[PDB]
Ligand binder design. Sequence first.
Ligand SMILES: Nc1nc2c(ncn2[C@@H]2O[C@H](COP(=O)(O)O)[C@@H](O)[C@H]2O)c(=O)[nH]1
Ligand SMILES: Nc1nc2c(ncn2[C@@H]2O[C@H](COP(=O)(O)O)[C@@H](O)[C@H]2O)c(=O)[nH]1
Lengths: 152, 152
Amino acid sequence: MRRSVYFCGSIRGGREDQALYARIVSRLRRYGKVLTEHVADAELEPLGEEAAGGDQFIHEQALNWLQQADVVVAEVTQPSLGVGYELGRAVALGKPILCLFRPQSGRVLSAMIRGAADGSRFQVWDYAEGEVETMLDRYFEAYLVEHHHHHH
Amino acid sequence: MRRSVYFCGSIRGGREDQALYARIVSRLRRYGKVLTEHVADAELEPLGEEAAGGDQFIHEQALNWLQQADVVVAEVTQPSLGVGYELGRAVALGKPILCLFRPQSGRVLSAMIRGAADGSRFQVWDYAEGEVETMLDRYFEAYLVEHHHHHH
Ligand SMILES: Nc1nc2c(ncn2[C@@H]2O[C@H](COP(=O)(O)O)[C@@H](O)[C@H]2O)c(=O)[nH]1
Ligand SMILES: Nc1nc2c(ncn2[C@@H]2O[C@H](COP(=O)(O)O)[C@@H](O)[C@H]2O)c(=O)[nH]1
């Protein structure tokens, strides 16, 4: 009834991912529902439990969003440890995962990542800078035309 | 009845992880059962299905081993994308996870990784080169003395 897409992008406390997150959030919300909202909130909602929350909460928030997230999509030009972990949980929790790696960033996907992309429900596309939009448009266009993730 | 510990280490087709894998395999097997055997086999068992197997098989082999692996232990000095993915699956599939990061390697654990270590069943210890043995000895000694992973 309701589709939810979770975006996975390494921020590392950077201000170069927020711009991408704001633009990707609007595109993901247009289809059904978009998560990864924490990386775009200029008003940390106060009140609640008076404890030392932070990193532990970060992991808990991502776990709760993936529960509803019917599909996961990632956009990282370099091998991110934190983002890689999220991808692993997405495959174990969900099924249809997406990965966007820049084929001209300099780095490369390790054996574990390459192996993960069996072709069933996990697809790893290569986007070269200005090609990120093409990959996102093709991913959303191919998803609507297929109406599922069964084809290899 | 039978305990199985799966070791997680970034190899990236390198010959610097095999030496560590051989020494860690013996220590892990001494306690109960050790996996990550693929990274130490000089005799690829032939025969079987005649297909293009490789990366997909790598991911499938790790998934099958974690099923029996009651506990997971990792030893990486730098943020590894492939290894990070395995850790995510270990927390989603199992529960008691271990992480060994070098506090003098140069890099650092991202927000996702730090958050993952809630202190419940996931413990991230810092080992400085020659301190890898100390972390492994304390991890195995603390596991036998506690007889479980409940303490925070
Ligand atoms: N749900 C959720 N995800 C988070 C939070 N903090 C970081 N993340 C996710 O963790 C990733 C960033 O990992 P890092 O850049 O630190 O390696 C991104 O995919 C981002 O969405 C948080 O508080 N909640
Ligand atoms: N079970 C299993 N694990 C593998 C295989 N190939 C690589 N790995 C695991 O993947 C990790 C290496 O990832 P990478 O160094 O390529 O980032 C190690 O933890 C290693 O045990 C394989 O064929 N089978």
